[PDB]
PDB file of C-alpha atoms in Angstrom:
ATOM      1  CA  UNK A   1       6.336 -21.967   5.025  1.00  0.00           C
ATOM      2  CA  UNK A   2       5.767 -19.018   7.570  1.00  0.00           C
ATOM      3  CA  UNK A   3       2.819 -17.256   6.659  1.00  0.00           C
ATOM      4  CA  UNK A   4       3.037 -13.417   6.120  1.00  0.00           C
ATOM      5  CA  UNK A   5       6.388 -13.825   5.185  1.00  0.00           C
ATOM      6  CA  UNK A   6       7.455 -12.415   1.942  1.00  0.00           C
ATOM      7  CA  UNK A   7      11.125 -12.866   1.789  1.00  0.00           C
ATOM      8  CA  UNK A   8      10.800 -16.920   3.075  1.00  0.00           C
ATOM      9  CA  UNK A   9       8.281 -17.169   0.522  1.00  0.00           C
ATOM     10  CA  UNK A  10       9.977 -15.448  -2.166  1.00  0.00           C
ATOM     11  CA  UNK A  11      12.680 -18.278  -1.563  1.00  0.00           C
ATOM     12  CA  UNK A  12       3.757 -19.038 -10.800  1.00  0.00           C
ATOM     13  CA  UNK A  13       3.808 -15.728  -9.991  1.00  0.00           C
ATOM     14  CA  UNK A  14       5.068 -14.271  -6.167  1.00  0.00           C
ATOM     15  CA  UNK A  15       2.648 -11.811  -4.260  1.00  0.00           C
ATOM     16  CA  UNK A  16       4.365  -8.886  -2.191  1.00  0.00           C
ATOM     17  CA  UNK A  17       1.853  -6.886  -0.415  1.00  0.00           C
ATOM     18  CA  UNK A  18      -1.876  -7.805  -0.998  1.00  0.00           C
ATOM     19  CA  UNK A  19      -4.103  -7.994  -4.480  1.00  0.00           C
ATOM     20  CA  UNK A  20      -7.896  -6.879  -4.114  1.00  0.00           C
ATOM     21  CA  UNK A  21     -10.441  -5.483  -5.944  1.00  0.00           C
ATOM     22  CA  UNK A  22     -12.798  -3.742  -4.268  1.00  0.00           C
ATOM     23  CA  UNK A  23     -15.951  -1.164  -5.003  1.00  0.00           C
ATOM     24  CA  UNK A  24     -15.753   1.573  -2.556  1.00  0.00           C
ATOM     25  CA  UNK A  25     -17.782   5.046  -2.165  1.00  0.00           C
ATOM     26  CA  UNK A  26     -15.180   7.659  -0.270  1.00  0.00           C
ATOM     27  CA  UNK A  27     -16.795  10.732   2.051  1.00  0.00           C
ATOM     28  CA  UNK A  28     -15.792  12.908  -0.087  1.00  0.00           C
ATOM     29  CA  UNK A  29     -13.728  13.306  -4.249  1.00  0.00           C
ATOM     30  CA  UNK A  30     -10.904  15.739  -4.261  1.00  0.00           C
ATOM     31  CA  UNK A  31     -11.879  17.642  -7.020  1.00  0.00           C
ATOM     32  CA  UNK A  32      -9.319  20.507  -6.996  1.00  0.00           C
ATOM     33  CA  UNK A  33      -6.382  18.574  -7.401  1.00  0.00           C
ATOM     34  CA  UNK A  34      -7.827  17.220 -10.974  1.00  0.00           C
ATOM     35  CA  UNK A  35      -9.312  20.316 -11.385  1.00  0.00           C
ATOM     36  CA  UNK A  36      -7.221  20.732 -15.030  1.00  0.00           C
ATOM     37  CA  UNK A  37      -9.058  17.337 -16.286  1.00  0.00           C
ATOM     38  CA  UNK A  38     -12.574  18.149 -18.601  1.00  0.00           C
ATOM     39  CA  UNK A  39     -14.345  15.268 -16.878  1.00  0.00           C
ATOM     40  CA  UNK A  40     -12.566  16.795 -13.554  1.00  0.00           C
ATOM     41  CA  UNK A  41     -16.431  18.449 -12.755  1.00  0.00           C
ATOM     42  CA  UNK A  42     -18.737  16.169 -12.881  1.00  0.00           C
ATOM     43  CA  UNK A  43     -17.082  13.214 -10.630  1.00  0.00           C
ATOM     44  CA  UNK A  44     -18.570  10.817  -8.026  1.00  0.00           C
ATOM     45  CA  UNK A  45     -17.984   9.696  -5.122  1.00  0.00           C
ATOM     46  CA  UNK A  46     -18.195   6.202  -5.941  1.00  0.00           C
ATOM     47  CA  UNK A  47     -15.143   4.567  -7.662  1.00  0.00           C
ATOM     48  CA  UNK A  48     -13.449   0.735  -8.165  1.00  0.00           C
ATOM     49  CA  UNK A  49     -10.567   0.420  -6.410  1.00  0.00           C
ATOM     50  CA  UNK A  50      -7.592  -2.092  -6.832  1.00  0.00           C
ATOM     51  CA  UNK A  51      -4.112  -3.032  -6.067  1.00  0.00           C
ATOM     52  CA  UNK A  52      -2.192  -5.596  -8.164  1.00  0.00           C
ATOM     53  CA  UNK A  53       1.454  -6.711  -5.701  1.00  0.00           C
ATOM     54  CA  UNK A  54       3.918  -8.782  -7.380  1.00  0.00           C
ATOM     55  CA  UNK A  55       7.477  -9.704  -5.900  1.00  0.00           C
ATOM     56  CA  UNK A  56      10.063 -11.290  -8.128  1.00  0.00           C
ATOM     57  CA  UNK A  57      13.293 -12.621  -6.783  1.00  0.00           C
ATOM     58  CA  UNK A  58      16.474 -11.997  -9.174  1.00  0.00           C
ATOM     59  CA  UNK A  59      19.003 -13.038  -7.327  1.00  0.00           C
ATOM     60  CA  UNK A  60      18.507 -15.664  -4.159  1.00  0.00           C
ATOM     61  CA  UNK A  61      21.823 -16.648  -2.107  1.00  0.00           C
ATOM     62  CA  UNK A  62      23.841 -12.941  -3.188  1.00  0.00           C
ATOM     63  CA  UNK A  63      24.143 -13.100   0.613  1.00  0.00           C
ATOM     64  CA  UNK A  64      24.224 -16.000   2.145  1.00  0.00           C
ATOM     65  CA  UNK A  65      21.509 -19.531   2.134  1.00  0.00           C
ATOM     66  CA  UNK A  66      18.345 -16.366   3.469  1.00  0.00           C
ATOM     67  CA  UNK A  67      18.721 -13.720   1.140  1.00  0.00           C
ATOM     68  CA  UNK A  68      17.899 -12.138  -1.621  1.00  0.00           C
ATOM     69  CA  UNK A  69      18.111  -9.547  -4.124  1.00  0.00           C
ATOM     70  CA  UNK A  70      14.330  -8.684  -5.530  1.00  0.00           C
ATOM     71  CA  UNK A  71      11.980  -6.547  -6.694  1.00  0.00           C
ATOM     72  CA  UNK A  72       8.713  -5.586  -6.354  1.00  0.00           C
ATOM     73  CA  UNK A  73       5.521  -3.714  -7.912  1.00  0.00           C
ATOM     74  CA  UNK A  74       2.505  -2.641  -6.527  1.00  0.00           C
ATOM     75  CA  UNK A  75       0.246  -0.796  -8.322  1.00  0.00           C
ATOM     76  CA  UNK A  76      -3.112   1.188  -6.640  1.00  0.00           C
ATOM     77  CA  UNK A  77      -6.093   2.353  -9.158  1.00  0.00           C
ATOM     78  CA  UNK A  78      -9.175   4.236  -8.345  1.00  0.00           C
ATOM     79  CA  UNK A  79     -11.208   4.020 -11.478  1.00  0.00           C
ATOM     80  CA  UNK A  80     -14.845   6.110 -11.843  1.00  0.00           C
ATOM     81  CA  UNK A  81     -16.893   3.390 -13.455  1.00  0.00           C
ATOM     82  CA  UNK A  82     -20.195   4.580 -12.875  1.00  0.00           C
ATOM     83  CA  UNK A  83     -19.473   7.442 -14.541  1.00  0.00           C
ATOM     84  CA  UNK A  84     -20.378   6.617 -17.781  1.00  0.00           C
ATOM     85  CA  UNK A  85     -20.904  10.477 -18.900  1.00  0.00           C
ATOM     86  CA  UNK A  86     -17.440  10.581 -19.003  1.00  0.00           C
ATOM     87  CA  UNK A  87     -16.467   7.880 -20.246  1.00  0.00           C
ATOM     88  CA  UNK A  88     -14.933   6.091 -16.542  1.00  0.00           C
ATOM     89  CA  UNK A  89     -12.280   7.206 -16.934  1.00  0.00           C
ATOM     90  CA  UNK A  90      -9.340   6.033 -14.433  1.00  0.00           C
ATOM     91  CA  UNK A  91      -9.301   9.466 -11.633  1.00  0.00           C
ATOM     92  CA  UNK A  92      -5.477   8.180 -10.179  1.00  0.00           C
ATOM     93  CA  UNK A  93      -3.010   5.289 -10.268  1.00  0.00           C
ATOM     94  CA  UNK A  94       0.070   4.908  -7.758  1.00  0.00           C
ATOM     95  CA  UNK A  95       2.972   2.471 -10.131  1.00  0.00           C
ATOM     96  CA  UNK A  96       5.227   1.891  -6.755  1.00  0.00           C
ATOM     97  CA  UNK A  97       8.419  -0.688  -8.136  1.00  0.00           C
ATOM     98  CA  UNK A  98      11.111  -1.232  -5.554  1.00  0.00           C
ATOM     99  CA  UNK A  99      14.473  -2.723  -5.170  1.00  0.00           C
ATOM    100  CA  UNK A 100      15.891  -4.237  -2.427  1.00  0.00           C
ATOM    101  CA  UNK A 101      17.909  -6.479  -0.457  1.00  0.00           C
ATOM    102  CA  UNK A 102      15.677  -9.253   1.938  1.00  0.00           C
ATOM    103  CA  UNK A 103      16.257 -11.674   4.776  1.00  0.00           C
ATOM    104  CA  UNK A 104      14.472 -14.508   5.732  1.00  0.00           C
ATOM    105  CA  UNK A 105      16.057 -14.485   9.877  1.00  0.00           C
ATOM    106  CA  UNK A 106      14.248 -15.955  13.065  1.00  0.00           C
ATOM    107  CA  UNK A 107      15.390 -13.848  15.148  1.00  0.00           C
ATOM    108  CA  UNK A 108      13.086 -14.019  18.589  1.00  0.00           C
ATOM    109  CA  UNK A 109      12.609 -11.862  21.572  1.00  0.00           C
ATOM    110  CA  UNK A 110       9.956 -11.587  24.135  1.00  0.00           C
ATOM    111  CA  UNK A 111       7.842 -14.114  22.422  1.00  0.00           C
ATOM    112  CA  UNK A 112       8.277 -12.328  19.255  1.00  0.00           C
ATOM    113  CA  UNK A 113      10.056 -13.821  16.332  1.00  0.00           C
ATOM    114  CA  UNK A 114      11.748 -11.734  13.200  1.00  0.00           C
ATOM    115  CA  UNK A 115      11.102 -12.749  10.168  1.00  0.00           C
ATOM    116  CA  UNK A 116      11.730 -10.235   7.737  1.00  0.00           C
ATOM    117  CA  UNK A 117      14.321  -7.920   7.125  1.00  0.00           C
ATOM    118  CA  UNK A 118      14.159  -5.531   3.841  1.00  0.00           C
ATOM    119  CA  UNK A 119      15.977  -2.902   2.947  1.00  0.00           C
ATOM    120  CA  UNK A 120      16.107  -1.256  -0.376  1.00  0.00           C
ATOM    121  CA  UNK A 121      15.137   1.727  -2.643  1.00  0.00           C
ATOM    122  CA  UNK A 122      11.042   2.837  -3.272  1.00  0.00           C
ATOM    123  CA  UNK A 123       9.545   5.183  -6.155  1.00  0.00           C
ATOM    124  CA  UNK A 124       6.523   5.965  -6.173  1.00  0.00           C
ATOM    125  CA  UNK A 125       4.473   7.741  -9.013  1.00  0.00           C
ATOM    126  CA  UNK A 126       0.915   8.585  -9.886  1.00  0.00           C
ATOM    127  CA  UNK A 127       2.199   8.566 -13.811  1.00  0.00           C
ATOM    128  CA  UNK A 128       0.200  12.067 -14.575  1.00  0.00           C
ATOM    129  CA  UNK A 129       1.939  15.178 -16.221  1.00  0.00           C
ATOM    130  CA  UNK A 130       1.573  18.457 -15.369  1.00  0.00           C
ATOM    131  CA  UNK A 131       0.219  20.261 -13.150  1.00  0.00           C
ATOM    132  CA  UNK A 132      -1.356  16.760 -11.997  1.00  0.00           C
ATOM    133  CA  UNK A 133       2.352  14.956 -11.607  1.00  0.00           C
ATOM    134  CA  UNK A 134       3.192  13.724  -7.861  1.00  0.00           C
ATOM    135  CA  UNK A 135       5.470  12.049  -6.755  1.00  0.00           C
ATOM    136  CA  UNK A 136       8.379  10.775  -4.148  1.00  0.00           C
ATOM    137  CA  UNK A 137      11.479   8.457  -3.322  1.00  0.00           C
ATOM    138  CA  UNK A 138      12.576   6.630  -0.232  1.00  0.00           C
ATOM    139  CA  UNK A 139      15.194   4.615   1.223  1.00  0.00           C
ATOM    140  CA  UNK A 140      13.510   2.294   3.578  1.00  0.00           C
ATOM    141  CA  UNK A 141      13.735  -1.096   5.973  1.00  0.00           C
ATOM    142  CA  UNK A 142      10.718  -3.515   5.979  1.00  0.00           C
ATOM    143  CA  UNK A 143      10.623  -5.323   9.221  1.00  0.00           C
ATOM    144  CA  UNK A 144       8.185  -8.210  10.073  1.00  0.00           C
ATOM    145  CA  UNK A 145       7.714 -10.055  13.031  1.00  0.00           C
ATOM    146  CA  UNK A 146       5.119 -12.630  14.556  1.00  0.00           C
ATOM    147  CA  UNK A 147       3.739 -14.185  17.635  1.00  0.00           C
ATOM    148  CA  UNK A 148       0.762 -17.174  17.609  1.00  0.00           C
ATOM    149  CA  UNK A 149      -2.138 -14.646  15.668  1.00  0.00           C
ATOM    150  CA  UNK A 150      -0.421 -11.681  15.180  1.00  0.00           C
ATOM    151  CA  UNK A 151       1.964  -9.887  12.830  1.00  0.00           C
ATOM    152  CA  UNK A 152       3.467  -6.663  12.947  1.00  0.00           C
ATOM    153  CA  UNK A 153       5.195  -4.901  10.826  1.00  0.00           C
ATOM    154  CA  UNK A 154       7.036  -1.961  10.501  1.00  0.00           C
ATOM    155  CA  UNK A 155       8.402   0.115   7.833  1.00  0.00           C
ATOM    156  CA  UNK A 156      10.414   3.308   8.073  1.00  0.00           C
ATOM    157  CA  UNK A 157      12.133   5.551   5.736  1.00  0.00           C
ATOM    158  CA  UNK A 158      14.412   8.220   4.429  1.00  0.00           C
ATOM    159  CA  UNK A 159      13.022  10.529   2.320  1.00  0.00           C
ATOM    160  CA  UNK A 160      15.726  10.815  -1.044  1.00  0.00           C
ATOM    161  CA  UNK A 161      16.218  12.849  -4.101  1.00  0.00           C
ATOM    162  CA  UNK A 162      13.896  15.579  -5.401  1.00  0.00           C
ATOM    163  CA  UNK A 163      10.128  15.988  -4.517  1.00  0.00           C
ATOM    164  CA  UNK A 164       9.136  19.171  -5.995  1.00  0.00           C
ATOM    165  CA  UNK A 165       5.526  18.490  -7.053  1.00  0.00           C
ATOM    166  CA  UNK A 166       4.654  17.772  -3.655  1.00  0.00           C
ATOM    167  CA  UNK A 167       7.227  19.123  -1.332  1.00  0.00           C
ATOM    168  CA  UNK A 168       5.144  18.675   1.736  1.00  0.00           C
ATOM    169  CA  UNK A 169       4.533  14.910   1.256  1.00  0.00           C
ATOM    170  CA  UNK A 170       6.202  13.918   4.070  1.00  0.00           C
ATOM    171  CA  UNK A 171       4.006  16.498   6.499  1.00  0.00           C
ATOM    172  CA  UNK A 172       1.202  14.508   5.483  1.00  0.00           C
ATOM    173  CA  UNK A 173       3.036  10.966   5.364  1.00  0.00           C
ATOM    174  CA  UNK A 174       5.327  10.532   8.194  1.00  0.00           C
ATOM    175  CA  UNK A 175       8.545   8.396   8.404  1.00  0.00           C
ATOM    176  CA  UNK A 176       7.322   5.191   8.663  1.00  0.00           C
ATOM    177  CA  UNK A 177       3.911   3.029   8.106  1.00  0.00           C
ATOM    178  CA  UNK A 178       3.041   0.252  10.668  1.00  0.00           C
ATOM    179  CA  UNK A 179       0.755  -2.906   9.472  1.00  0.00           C
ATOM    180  CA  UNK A 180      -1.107  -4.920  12.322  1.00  0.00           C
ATOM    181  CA  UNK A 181      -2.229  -8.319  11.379  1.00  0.00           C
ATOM    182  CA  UNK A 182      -4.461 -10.435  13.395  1.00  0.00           C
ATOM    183  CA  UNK A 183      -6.039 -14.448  12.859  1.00  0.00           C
ATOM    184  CA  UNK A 184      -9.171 -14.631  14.030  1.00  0.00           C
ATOM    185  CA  UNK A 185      -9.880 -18.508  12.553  1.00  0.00           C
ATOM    186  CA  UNK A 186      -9.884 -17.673   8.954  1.00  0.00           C
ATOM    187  CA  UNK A 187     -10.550 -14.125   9.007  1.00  0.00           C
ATOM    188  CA  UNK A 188      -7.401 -11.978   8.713  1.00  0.00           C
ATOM    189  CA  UNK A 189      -8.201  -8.529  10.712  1.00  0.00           C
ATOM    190  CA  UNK A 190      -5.442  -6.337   9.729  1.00  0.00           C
ATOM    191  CA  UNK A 191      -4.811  -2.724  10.451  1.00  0.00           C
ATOM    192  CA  UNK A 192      -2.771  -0.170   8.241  1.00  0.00           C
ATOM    193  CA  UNK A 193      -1.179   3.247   9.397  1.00  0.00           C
ATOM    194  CA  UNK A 194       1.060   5.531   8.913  1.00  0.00           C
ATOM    195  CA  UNK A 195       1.236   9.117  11.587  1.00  0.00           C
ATOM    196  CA  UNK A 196       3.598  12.466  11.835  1.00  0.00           C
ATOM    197  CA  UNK A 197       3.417  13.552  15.610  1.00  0.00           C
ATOM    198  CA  UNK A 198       5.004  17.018  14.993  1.00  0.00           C
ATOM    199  CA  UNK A 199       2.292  17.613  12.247  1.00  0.00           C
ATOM    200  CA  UNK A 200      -0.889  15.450  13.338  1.00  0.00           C
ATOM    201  CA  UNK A 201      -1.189  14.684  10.160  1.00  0.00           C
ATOM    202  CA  UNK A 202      -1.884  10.815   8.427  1.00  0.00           C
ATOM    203  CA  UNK A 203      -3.951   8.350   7.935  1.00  0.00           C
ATOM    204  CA  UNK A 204      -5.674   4.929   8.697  1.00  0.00           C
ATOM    205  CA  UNK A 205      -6.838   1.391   6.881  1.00  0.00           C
ATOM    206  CA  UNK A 206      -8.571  -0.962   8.110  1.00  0.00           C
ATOM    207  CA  UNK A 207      -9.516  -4.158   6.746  1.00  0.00           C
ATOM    208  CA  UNK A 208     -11.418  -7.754   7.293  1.00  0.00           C
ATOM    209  CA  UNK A 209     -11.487 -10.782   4.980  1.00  0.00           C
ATOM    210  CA  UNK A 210     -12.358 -14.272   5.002  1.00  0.00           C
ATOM    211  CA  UNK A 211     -12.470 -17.214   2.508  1.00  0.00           C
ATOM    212  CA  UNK A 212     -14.906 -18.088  -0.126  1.00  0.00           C
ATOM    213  CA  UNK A 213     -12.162 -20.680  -1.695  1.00  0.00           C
ATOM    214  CA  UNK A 214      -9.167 -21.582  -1.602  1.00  0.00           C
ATOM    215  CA  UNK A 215      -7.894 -18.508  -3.827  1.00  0.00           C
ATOM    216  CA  UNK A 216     -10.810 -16.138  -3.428  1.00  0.00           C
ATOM    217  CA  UNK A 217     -11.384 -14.289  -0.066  1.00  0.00           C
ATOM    218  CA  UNK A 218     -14.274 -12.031   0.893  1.00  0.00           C
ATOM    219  CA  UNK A 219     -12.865  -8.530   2.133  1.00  0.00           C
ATOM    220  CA  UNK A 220     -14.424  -5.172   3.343  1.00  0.00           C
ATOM    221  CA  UNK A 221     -11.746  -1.618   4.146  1.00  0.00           C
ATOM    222  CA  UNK A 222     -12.323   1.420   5.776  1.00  0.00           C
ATOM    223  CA  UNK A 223      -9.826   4.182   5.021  1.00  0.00           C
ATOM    224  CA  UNK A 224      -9.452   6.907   6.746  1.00  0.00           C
ATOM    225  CA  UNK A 225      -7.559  10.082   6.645  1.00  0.00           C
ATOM    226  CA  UNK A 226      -4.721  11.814   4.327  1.00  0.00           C
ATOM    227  CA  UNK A 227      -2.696  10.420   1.690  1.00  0.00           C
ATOM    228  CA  UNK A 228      -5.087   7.491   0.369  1.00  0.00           C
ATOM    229  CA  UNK A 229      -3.263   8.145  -2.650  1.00  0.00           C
ATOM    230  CA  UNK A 230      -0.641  10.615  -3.630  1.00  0.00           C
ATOM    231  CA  UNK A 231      -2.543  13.275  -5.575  1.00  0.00           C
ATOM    232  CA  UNK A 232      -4.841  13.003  -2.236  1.00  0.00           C
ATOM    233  CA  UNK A 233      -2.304  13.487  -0.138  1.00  0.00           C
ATOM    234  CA  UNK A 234      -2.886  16.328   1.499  1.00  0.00           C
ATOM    235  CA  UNK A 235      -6.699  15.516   0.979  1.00  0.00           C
ATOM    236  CA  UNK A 236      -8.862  13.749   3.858  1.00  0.00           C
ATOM    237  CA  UNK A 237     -11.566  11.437   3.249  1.00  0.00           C
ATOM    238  CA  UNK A 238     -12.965   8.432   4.723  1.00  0.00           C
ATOM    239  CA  UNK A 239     -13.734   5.251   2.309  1.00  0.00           C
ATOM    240  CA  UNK A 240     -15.261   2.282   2.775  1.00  0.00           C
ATOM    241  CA  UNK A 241     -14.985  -0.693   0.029  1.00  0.00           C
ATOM    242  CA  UNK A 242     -16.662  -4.289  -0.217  1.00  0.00           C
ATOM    243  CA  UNK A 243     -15.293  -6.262  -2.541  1.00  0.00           C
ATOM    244  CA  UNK A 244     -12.611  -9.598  -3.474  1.00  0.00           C
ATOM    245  CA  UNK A 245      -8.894 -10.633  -1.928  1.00  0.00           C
ATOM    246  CA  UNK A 246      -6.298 -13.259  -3.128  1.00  0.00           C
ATOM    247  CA  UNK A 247      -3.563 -12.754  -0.400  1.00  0.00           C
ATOM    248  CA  UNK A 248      -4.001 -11.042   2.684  1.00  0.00           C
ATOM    249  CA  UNK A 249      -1.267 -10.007   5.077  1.00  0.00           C
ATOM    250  CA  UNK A 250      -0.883 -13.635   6.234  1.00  0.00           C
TER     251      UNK A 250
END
């Protein structure tokens, strides 16, 4: 089985990253960026957030008895549902499909063992038009490895093609984004990050969750920083979020 592994696993529906839904109140609404929306005004601090992350294998064995051609989708909402004045309407969504090219290997060194090895293409889109559009694409390399508790993965990337309604992404982004996962018994600690040195600039997610049931886990996050989402991503805020899990990062 391997758990945390998304390429062994991907060899019913298949998860990729995680699927939550949680209600979260963030430090503080980036109202300038959706200044051009009517509702744009009168917005709270308090929205629903979600994530839905599918993988789908197309093509297992293109390379050999471990690998894979797939795809994935993971989708990120922030939806104002208290605000009934106008209507909740959804503030930002983040449609993020990739395709790639995955290993399941077992690679292991100092104690550590490789399980993972992705490399493909990544768009990423908040959907809006004008002057509200964002956007960005990126070659990158997933790479996951464990050891007794932990997992840690690490992601990095090439920044490709255009990115002219936000040409500064990657000042606020980085290169790369790191995931710590931890067992503690049940309870999957798991940290999420992503950091430019030469800028200072990024951000921080932290997370804890535990099982109700066998399909339903409890699960609190604490973000932290710039580029929560992409038309906050040169925005700081800190949220916090209580709410449900299906997967976690292992």
């Amino acid at each position: 089985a391997v758990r945390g592994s998304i390429i062994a696993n991907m060899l019913t529906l298949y998860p990729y990253d995680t699927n939550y839904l949680i209600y979260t109140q963030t430090s503080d609404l980036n109202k300038e960026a959706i200044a051009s929306y009517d509702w744009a005004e009168n917005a709270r601090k308090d929205e629903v957030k979600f994530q839905l992350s599918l993988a789908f294998p197309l093509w297992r064995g293109i390379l050999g008895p471990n690998s894979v051609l797939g795809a994935s989708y993971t989708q990120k909402s922030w939806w104002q549902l208290s605000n009934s004045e106008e209507s909740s309407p959804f503030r930002e969504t983040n449609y993020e499909p990739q395709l790639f090219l995955g290993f399941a290997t077992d690679y292991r060194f100092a104690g550590w063992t490789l399980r993972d090895v992705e490399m493909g293409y990544n768009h990423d889109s908040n959907g809006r038009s004008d002057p509200t559009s964002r956007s960005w694409n990126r070659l990158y390399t997933r790479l996951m490895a464990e050891n007794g508790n932990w997992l840690v993965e690490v992601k990095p990337w090439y920044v490709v093609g255009n990115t002219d309604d936000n040409p500064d992404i990657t000042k606020y982004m980085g290169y790369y984004q790191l995931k710590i996962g931890y067992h503690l018994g049940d309870a999957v600690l798991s940290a999420k990050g992503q950091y430019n040195w030469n800028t200072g600039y990024g951000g921080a997610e932290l997370g804890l969750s535990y099982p109700i049931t066998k399909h339903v886990r409890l699960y609190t996050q604490v973000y932290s920083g710039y580029g929560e989402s992409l038309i906050d991503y040169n925005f700081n805020q800190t949220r916090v979020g209580v709410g449900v899990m299906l997967n976690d990062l292992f």
